[PDB]
Every structure is written in C-alpha cells, then in structure tokens.
Design a protein around this ligand. Sequence first.
Ligand SMILES: Cc1nc2c(c(CO)nn2[C@@H](C)c2ccc(C(F)(F)F)cc2)c(=O)[nH]1
Ligand SMILES: Cc1nc2c(c(CO)nn2[C@@H](C)c2ccc(C(F)(F)F)cc2)c(=O)[nH]1
Ligand SMILES: [Mg+2]
Ligand SMILES: [Mg+2]
Ligand SMILES: [Zn+2]
Ligand SMILES: [Zn+2]
Lengths: 348, 343
Amino acid sequence: LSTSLYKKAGFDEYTKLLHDGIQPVAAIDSNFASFTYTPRSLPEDDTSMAILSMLQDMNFINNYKIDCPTLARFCLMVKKGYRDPPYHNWMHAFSVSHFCYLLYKNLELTNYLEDIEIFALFISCMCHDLDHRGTNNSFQVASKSVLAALYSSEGSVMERHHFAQAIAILNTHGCNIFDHFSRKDYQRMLDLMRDIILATDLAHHLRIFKDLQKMAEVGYDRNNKQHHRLLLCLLMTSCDLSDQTKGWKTTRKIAELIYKEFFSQGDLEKAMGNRPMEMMDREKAYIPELQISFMEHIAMPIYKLLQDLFPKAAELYERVASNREHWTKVSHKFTIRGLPSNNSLDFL
Amino acid sequence: SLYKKAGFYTKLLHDGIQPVAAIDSNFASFTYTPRSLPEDDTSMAILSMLQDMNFINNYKIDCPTLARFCLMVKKGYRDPPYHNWMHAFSVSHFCYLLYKNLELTNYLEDIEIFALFISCMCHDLDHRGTNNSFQVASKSVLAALYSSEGSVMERHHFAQAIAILNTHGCNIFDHFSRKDYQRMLDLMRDIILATDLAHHLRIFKDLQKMAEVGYDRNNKQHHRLLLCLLMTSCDLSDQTKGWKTTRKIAELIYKEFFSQGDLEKAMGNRPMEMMDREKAYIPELQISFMEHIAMPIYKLLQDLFPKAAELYERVASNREHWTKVSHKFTIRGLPSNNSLDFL
Ligand SMILES: Cc1nc2c(c(CO)nn2[C@@H](C)c2ccc(C(F)(F)F)cc2)c(=O)[nH]1
Ligand SMILES: Cc1nc2c(c(CO)nn2[C@@H](C)c2ccc(C(F)(F)F)cc2)c(=O)[nH]1
Ligand SMILES: [Mg+2]
Ligand SMILES: [Mg+2]
Ligand SMILES: [Zn+2]
Ligand SMILES: [Zn+2]
C-alpha cells in the first residue's frame, strides 16, 4: 500500500535555465518536430528548456510578448506541480505538450484555429493533470477527499482541481505568463484553459462524441465558432492519448505504468474495505483484452476523427491500429491476470 | 415568446445614494415587498443597499463606475413575465435583508457577502424566458457553448456579468489585486451556478448534513455550502412574502413557462406538464414546488439561523393557502386574461 504514496517536491534551476538562451528545437533533436519522436526519451532535466523551445518555434513568445524569465518560472512551477505516480507525472504532461507542438507543425493548425486558441491548448496540455494523485474521480468520492467535497457537485473532480492548480500557479508571484494580455484577453485565455482541461474527462469526450462525428462528416469550417470549440476538445484528447501513436515499445511501457498506477488504487480500495472496478483489480484485470477494448472504443475513434479532419493525421491512426494489432498478438502469449510479480512487461 | 433587449447616470450621481429609511421605513424588514418599488427607483436602491452594507467604503468602490455597472446590469435583462430586472432587484433586496437581519458577518467572510450580493444582481442576466432543457432542444448558441458543461443558462448569466465588468468604465473590481479579483470572479461563478435547480438537487444531501452537525465557520466546505443555500433562498424569496405576492408571482412564472410550452409545441416537441397550458394544474405544481424545493431550503435556513424562523413559517403558510385553493381552482393553465384573481 506504500506504492500509493506519491509526493509533492514542494509547496503550492531558473537562472541556470535561461543562462544560454532558448535552444532552437532542431538543436534539441533533428527529429523533434516529427510524429516519430518519443518525448519520454528526452532527459527530465531538459524538458523545461524544451517547453520554452516549442513556444518560441510556434512564435508564441514573440506574438504574445511573453517575458522569458516569467515563462521559465511558470514552466518550473508547473513541473514541480506534478506528484510522482507511475503514469500521471510531469513526463506525461511533457509528452502531451510535445504532441500539441507536433499537431501544430504537421497538421498546420494555424489554418484551422486562432493563434490564442492554439496557445491555450499548449498551456492546457502542460497543466491538464496538475497534482494528480494516481487515483481517478470515483476514488475521490469513495475516499471522501477534500477534492470530492469541493468539486463532485460540479462534476469532473480531478479535472476541476487540475484547472484550479493552473490558476494558482498563474497567481503565484513572477509566474503570470499572461501579463501582456488585456483584461478581456486574459479572461478569454482562462476560459479557454478551463474548457480544454475539462475536455480531458473521458465522460466529457463521450458527451460531445456525436457532435465531433458530425463536424468530421460535414467538414471543418474555420469561420464556425462551435467547430473551433469541438476541435480544441478533440485535439486535447488526442494529445492526452498520444503515447498510443508511438512505437510498440512505448505503448507496452505505458501499459505497464498505467496498470501499476491503476492496481495500486485497486489495492488501496481493498485496504479500505471496498471493491475496485475490474480494470483496477490485479486479480480480475486481463491487460491485453482491456488494452484492446481501450484501443477499439476510445483511442482509435479519436485518431480516426483526426484523420477524417486532417488527411496528414493518417499515419497516427495507422500507428494506433498497428498497436491494437500488437495487443491482439500479446493476448495469445500472456497467461496471467494483472501484471507479473516484477511489475514489468519485459517477459514479452 | 419574444422578449426584447432594450439596448446593445447623471441623475444617479446627483441623489442615487439615499439613506434606506428615505426609500421606505420598512426597507430593512422581512415584510418589505421590493416588487412594490417603482422600477425607475431600483438603481438608486441598489446603491443605497451597497452603501448601507458599507461595501462601497470597505472595498474602495469608485461611485461613478458603480453607477455605470448598476445601469449596465439593469439593461442586461430582457422583458419576460418573470425573469426580468425586477426579479434580479427583488433577489438582491433579499440578500440585503439577510445581511441586515441574520448577522451574516458572523458566518461568512465580508468578500463572500459582497460576492453574494453582486451575484444576486447578475444571476439571471440575459434570461430568455426559457429553461436549460429548452436551450438544448432548440439547439441554441447558448446550448452550443455550455450544454456539454451543464447549467446552460447559469453559465451564460455569469459570462454576461463578466462581459459587463470588462466594459469600459464598469469594472467595479479593477483596483483589486490579481488574487482578490480571481477570488471574486470564482465566488460569482460558484454562486451563480448554485441557482441551477439541478445543482441544488446535487448538494441537498451535503446541505442537510451541515445543518445536522452544525455550522463550522472554520470549515471552508461549510462557507461554500452556506453560500449556495443563501443564494437559493434569495432566488426563491418571493415565497416568503404574503399571499398576494405568491399568487402574482405564480401568474408571472406560469405565463412565462406556458409561453415556452407553446414554442415547444410549434417545434413539434411535447413540453413537460409544468410548461403545458393544456396539462398544467398551477396549485398542484405550486404545492409540489413548495414541498420539495422552497420549504426545505427555508427549513435549512431556520436550522442555521433561528432568526429566519419567520421566513419558513410564511412559506409553510403560503403552501397551506395553495392546498386550500386547490379546490377553489378547477381549471388547467391560466384564464384568458392570465390572472389568478378568481381565488
Ligand atoms: C485503460 C487505459 N486508460 C488509459 C491509457 C492511457 C495512455 O494512453 N491513458 N488512459 C487514461 C488515463 C485516459 C483515458 C481517456 C482519456 C481521454 F479522455 F482523454 F480520452 C484520458 C486518459 C491506456 O493505455 N489504457
Ligand atoms: C415551479 C416554480 N419554479 C419557480 C418558482 C419561482 C419563484 O419563487 N422560481 N422558480 C424557478 C424559476 C426556480 C426554481 C429553483 C431555483 C433554485 F435553484 F435557486 F432553487 C431557482 C429558480 C415558482 O413559484 N414555481
Ligand atoms: Mg487527467
Ligand atoms: Mg436562473
Ligand atoms: Zn493526462
Ligand atoms: Zn432568479
């Protein structure tokens, strides 16, 4: 049960960060702007600089006149804002943010969304799981947590907390990256971040799914305000699940992290005298079938919509479909429930 | 179903801040009927109440900015039978009565009371005389913006309030620090969202629990729950007045609801009973509303504030009057002239 203890490094580095200026994206890696780049390969100590590099490459620092020391402090505060569970940690937020940058470079998002909307999407990616406890929304209610007391009445418990943590950072002395905005634009920016972070709740995704399908059917209209809103939600879910667009070795490792996290929650629920849901129970869970279901009912339809809207996103859908096929192959040589005793999927 | 917006100060600066007894000797009493005040005197009365609660001085509110803000809020309401400016003014007046009679300063932070009052003024801004289900059924721009999030109209009312604050010369909170400005807007969001009946249904179990264990002023959840309870008591305060007030407000509420029902029939949709002039039995619906919604709110208010007992007793008395009337009433909907005087 001690595996459910995930620490915060501080409370709710910098001069060294900007010492040699912002590194151009190609100097980080020649493959940095490619769908074949695996952001989790980047040393954790280099991620803060990579956030600044992406924002500079997307021209947001220049367009929004972002004070670089304020941006450096904000980046570091966001990074410090994640705990250390197996999956919902800063490297997850970093990977999600990188994928938003990949969509910008490869899908030519500037021809579909307003500059401010893309910038809000990127910042939302960085913040979208802030202070995650390695437990889901249902656990918050069951454990009668401070978070459930605060947000169960307004829905999407963790997501509302992630947004509140983002605002708390913007309100910390020397971290307000949106200080060059007028009161009107600052308000628009926080309303965009609120909606985008809320879009990471799977229940929200399922609620707008028919609207996303209709938008992909009729075709995206850049002069349609609802199309902009729907597209921002779809893109946020695509960034959140972007590990599924990588190579087999990435998807397998991410399944190991996800199930180690889920199973620790299930074990904690058992120690509390409760019955966890099947996928969180190491004695009931069959990982290959659970991953196949997740790929077929959640991940693949998101990337199929992405391909329907953006033909250049075809390679992403193809990679997710190929990883679903890999789980089918694993299902014919994986004879255990849960994870092996060593918590590793290396035996494959 | 067509309810217009009137648009897209010097008089209020000359004598807008009047002592409250000059408005009415009974102005600070639970027996006052704010709907009796001429509409043309309501902006002055809002200023008088903010001065009487000492919010203007305490928060260094700029008076011309406050006068502009009040006028903008008043102009931000349409003219449906019920959800108009007179409704927001009467709701604001009740918040003032709670401040004057229940010693709120002993349960909530000054800023929470101030946010509650401003939220009252703004809580139904730009209301269309239709509920949240109608927004979704009509595929309106409001449903497009907020239906996936929930509480369609309440999210719009809050958006309208912020749009007024962001209008030149109307930002009554401009001088506030970033943290305080954020705190105020977050309080307004939470309080306006608490006016959705769907939200009240979801928090009733917690409200009941708070009243049972007893209010704890050091408990942050208690402050949030108390604000929701106070806001709903302000929103339903017409039920705490005399029989003539509750009869007249039922006339306004149902003229509004029946118009939505007519619109739904024209869309080829089956409206719910309450909105259907051909199915609705007003006394039955009013008794159900009093028993399930209004009376439990005022009973929880009496449990937390014994000085609020007179409010619960008045609501219970009005419910009894609807039950007696539910024999002297035989018709569905409203008569041709839309009057309930036949009781
Ligand atoms: C069963 C399962 N759940 C997963 C996986 C991953 C990694 O790609 N994330 N999640 C969860 C946390 C998740 C689901 C759904 C959204 C959405 F709402 F954005 F779509 C976000 C997050 C996975 O591999 N298996
Ligand atoms: C059926 C019915 N509904 C009424 C009445 C009144 C007037 O007192 N207002 N409402 C609705 C609009 C309403 C309900 C409930 C909240 C709450 F969530 F804040 F409690 C707000 C508003 C009434 O007399 N009958
Ligand atoms: Mg999340
Ligand atoms: Mg309302
Ligand atoms: Zn995430
Ligand atoms: Zn109201």
